[PDB]
């Protein structure tokens, strides 16, 4: 290895760095001197060859050297003024940035007092007075709240949640997901979400085997996986009921909660209670529940063939309602009847499973155990409470078997995601010592 795209850099070879990038060339990767080719193109003042880095390599700004350093630190130690610009103008820059001596780029720019240092400093000085960039975390409902990034893409999860304007009582409840259409991780407090934005490509290649090109990730305020169901009842915070109640409409809604009829008609009916209000027999009585305004509170997998013939008791369960009152309390309600669903609270992972045919599976795992999908038709296979079921990780970390001591039933999933479903297993079952 000659490292041609790193030397390319100090050299400051604009056309030659660049058609390195095309020909594969990481721009992450670090020397025999421990330095990615960003930190050669900033040492040594290669303007061009850092913009190019930025920009057509996507490199992170914050990249740190292998003694810890940045391209800021870099950029401003050598008082290369204009590359300080460029890196103060990446929406992803870490301003707040320190080396491995605790020093911030512009102690080290003053110190040296090397090249435009004058100007480096001013530009630091007043970046100041910049406003942070923004990351959205969007909630079940759609919506979402723009959250500022303290420490650009080296921003935690913690300090995102900080900048949720959410109580103390309110916040325990939840945490920071990356959720692509396909596949959704819940991310611990210390780590940084948009460096998972920038990786997902690799993320998805490691756990799926989905286009990444067709994945599109953003980040969630979502149900924390591990909280406890006697915990969860005891809740009684406006903003959060409300957080959740959307959160259990929407897996409702896309048919992850496997009920008898019973259950999702008495869902069905509350969900009218709190859009529409009371009963009133003008508006609701004949011809109403039709097709448009049924899929917004029956599970889409029974909107077909199941729902239409739930009209009537839909709307008996719904006028009895009419004749509690607050917002909140319809919601607690709401989930009170989902509290009692085996999926619910559940993370859910993606497999196979091959009768010896093949089957997709959806796996789900939550405080009350492990359960299985019919990926199609969301029917509920198999479901294990803890404490009646063994599991074990497969050779390859690519599958995962279960071992049921009732039923005696032994089977085994095929999933890159086999990992994940046993860390998380264990993890929950600690949680009933």
Known sequence: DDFPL????????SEL???????????NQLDSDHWAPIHYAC?????????????????????????????????????????????LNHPETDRHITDQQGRS?????????????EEAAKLLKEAINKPYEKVRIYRMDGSYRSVELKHGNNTTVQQIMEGMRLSQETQQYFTIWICSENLSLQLKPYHKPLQHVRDWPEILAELTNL????????????????????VEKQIEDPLAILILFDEARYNLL????????????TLASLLLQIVYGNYESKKHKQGFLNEENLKSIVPVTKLKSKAPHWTNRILHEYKNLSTSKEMHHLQRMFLQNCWEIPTYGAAFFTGQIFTKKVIPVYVGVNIKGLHLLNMETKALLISLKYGCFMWQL??????????????????????????????????????LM
């Open 211 to 230: 286009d990444p090109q067709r994945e599109t990730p953003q980040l969630f305020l979502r149900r924390d996986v591990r909280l406890p169901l006697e």
């Open 43 to 87: 040492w040594y003042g290669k303007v061009e060859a850092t913009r190019i880095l930025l920009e057509k390599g996507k490199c992170n700004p914050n990249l740190l050297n292998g003694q810890l350093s940045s391209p800021l630190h870099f950029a401003a130690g050598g008082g290369h003024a204009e590359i300080v610009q460029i890196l």
């Open 394 to 431: 497969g050779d390859t970390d690519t599958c995962f078997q279960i071992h049921s001591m009732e039923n005696k039933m032994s089977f085994i999933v095929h999933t890159k995601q086999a990992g994940l479903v046993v860390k998380l297993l264990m993890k929950l079952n600690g949680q």
């Open 105 to 117: 780029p512009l102690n080290i720019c003053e110190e040296n007092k090397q090249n435009n240092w």
């Open 254 to 265: 896309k048919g992850f909660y496997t009920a008898p009829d019973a259950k999702l008609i």
């Open 6 to 13: 790193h030397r390319s850099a100090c050299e400051g070879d």
């Open 17 to 27: 760095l660049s058609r390195l990038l095309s020909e594969r060339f990481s721009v």
